[PDB]
Amino acid sequence: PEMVRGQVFDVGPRYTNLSYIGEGAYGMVCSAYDNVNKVRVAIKKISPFEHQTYCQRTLREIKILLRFRHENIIGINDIIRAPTIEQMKDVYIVQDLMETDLYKLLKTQHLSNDHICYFLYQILRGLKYIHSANVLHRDLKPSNLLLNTTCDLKICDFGLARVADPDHDHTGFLTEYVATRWYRAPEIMLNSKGYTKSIDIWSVGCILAEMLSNRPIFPGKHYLDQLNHILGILGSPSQEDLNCIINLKARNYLLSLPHKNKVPWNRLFPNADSKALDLLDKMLTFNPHKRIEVEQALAHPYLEQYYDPSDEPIAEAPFKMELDDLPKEKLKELIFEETARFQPG
Numbered sequence: 214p215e216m217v218r219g220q221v222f223d224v225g226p227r228y229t230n231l232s233y234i235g236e237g238a239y240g241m242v243c244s245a246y247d248n249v250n251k252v253r254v255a256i257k258k259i260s261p262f263e264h265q266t267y268c269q270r271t272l273r274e275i276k277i278l279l280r281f282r283h284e285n286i287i288g289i290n291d292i293i294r295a296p297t298i299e300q301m302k303d304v305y306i307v308q309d310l311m312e313t314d315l316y317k318l319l320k321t322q323h324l325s326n327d328h329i330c331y332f333l334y335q336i337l338r339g340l341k342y343i344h345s346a347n348v349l350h351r352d353l354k355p356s357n358l359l360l361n362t363t364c365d366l367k368i369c370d371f372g373l374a375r376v377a378d379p380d381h382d383h384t385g386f387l388t389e390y391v392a393t394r395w396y397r398a399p400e401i402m403l404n405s406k407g408y409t410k411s412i413d414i415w416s417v418g419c420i421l422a423e424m425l426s427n428r429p430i431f432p433g434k435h436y437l438d439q440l441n442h443i444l445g446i447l448g449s450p451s452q453e454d455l456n457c458i459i460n461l462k463a464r465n466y467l468l469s470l471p472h473k474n475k476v477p478w479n480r481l482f483p484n485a486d487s488k489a490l491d492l493l494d495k496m497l498t499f500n501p502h503k504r505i506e507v508e509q510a511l512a513h514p515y516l517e518q519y520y521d522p523s524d525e526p527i528a529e530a531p532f533k534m535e536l537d538d539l540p541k542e543k544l545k546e547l548i549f550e551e552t553a554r555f556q557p558g
């Protein structure tokens with residue numbers, strides 16, 4: 214087998230000429246030449262089976278991405294694993310190869326307003342499809358937005374996703390950790406389990422803000438600091454918005470804060486398009502009920518050069534998961550079952 218930075222990559226005979234791209238807690242990713250389709254592809258090696266949480270993420274991603282088909286969502290092209298459960302220690306997920314991601318691009322490149330408009334359009338277009346399947350991505354952030362050399366965009370990492378459940382979204386104060394900190398909506402810290410579509414629109418608003426200036430808008434230094442940053446810009450919530458928070462710990466925390474005024478978006482973003490800032494304001498609304506939805510966002514004047522509802526497709530049916538009571542050994546079985554279609558057979 215070919216070897217990459219110490220690791221076996223058991224991907225042949227189909228996939229050859231491996232080059233290292235990167236690594237993280239998920240495992241290791243390489244580009245490889247696909248000897249069937251005659252393109253280089255991305256292959257990520259995941260070895261999740263000793264951690265229930267890694268099994269959850271692996272299974273969720275596989276189940277979602279095999280069902281989804283959308284230009285702005287990364288596919289799964291192939292899955293390589295051992296022929297038996299006994300022998301399966303790794304799962305190799307083969308995906309379209311992209312040149313970069315929005316995190317890398319924002320650390321190096323100024324984005325023209327046309328680039329910001331086009332990226333946001335593609336983000337919202339993919340999100341329309343995801344939300345139309347009754348799915349929440351729940352970890353939208355620059356590094357989960359892949360880009361190619363012509364600025365086509367694809368959303369990746371569906372391992373944190375959930376089916377939407379707005380009737381069971383209420384919880385208590387300072388208990389929930391949904392999303393990545395800088396992209397996490399105020400309500401997560403206050404009273405929300407992150408089971409409504411509004412969680413994703415918030416993260417998109419943070420992304421848009423970050424594309425305008427190359428800096429995260431709410432750079433919390435730790436979990437508790439995040440609300441300080443959000444409220445620092447948005448200002449004190451209104452009586453009405455406060456009255457929606459029925460939980461007393463969360464209510465009284467907010468009431469305990471000194472009054473803060475809204476920092477105007479045109480002072481934070483003096484070079485931004487005024488239509489972009491109007492949309493930004495609507496995405497970064499404190500009250501998740503008042504926050505703009507994905508289909509309204511697409512119809513916003515900022516995106517009028519792109520907007521075409523007939524070319525913004527939806528899922529053929531809502532998606533249908535209950536994996537937190539399942540042991541890692543059971544999750545391994547379901548991953549084996551779900552990857553069966555890619556086997557010689």
Ligand SMILES: Cc1cccc([C@@H](CO)NC(=O)[C@@H](C)N2Cc3ccc(-c4nc(NC5CCOCC5)ncc4Cl)cc3C2=O)c1
Nearest residue numbers: 238239242255267270271308310311312313314369370372
């Ligand atoms: C913790 C954990 C345990 C078990 C599973 C997981 C899973 C499900 O949550 N998470 C993931 O795999 C998450 C974490 N990643 C890692 C990853 C790496 C590469 C690519 C990718 N990159 C390119 N090009 C590069 C872009 C940047 O510049 C150089 C080129 N092209 C195509 C692709 Cl697909 C995508 C993903 C992805 O989705 C996580």
